[PDB]
Swiss-Prot record, chain B:
This protein's name: 1-phosphatidylinositol 4,5-bisphosphate phosphodiesterase gamma-2
Job description of the protein: The production of the second messenger molecules diacylglycerol (DAG) and inositol 1,4,5-trisphosphate (IP3) is mediated by activated phosphatidylinositol-specific phospholipase C enzymes. It is a crucial enzyme in transmembrane signaling.
Organism per entry: Mus musculus
Location of the SH2 domain: 13-116
Reported modifications of this chain: Phosphorylated on tyrosine residues by BTK and SYK; upon ligand-induced activation of a variety of growth factor receptors and immune system receptors. Phosphorylation leads to increased phospholipase activity. Phosphorylated on tyrosine residues by CSF1R.
Position of the signal peptide: none
Cell location: Membrane raft
Record text on subunit structure and interactions: Part of a complex composed of EEIG1, TNFRSF11A/RANK, PLCG2, GAB2, TEC and BTK; complex formation increases in the presence of TNFSF11/RANKL. Interacts (via SH2 domain) with CSF1R (tyrosine phosphorylated). Interacts constitutively with THEMIS2.
Amino acid sequence: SAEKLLQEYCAETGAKDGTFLVRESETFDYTLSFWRSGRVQHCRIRSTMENGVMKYYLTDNLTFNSIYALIQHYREAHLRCAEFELRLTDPVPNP
Amino acid sequence: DTPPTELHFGEKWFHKKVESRTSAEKLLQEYCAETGAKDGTFLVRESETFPNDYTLSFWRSGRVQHCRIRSTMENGVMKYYLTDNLTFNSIYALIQHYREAHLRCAEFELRLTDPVP
C-alpha cells in the first residue's frame, strides 16, 4: 500500500519529515500521507461547494480551488488536520 | 509505576500495561468498534519510541491516532505537552484541557516537504 511505499522510500533514503504523496480515496476525496518521525501519518482531504464552486480543505476555515493549491500552501505553512483536531472524551477502561 | 505527578489523580485512561502501539490500537478497536464508543475515546501509555515520554492514543471512527506527550523539566518542574505552546504540570491537566479544547498534536506541527517520486 501507499503507506508502505512511503515507509520504504523514507527509511531507505533518510527522507526528512514532510515527505508525502496524495492518493485518491476508495469510495468517497483524497488522502494525504506524510513521513513524520519514523511513522507515516495521514489526513483526509475533504471537498465541498462554496457558493457554487468546488473547494478542497484539510481544515474547514481554509479552502482551496485544487489539490495543487492545497499542497503548496501546506508546503509554506504547517499542516492542519480537522479529521484529528477533536476533543478527547471517554477513557478506555482496562489494558 | 505511574509518574509521581499523577499520585493524587483518578486516571481511568492511564495504562502503563499497554506497552505497544499495536497493542493500543487493538484495545481501542475491541472497546470502540462495535460498542458505540464516542470519537475521542482514548488512553495514555508510555512511549514505545521515546524514553521518559508518553503517548496519547485515541479513537476516531475506525481510526486510531497516536500523539507523543513530551515531558521535560523546566526550572525544576516537570512539564508535559503535545506542543510546546502550552505545558501542564500533570498528564491529568493535559487530558482535562484536551477534553475542552481540540487536540493539536506535534506530529502535525510541520510543513509538507517533498512528494515521493
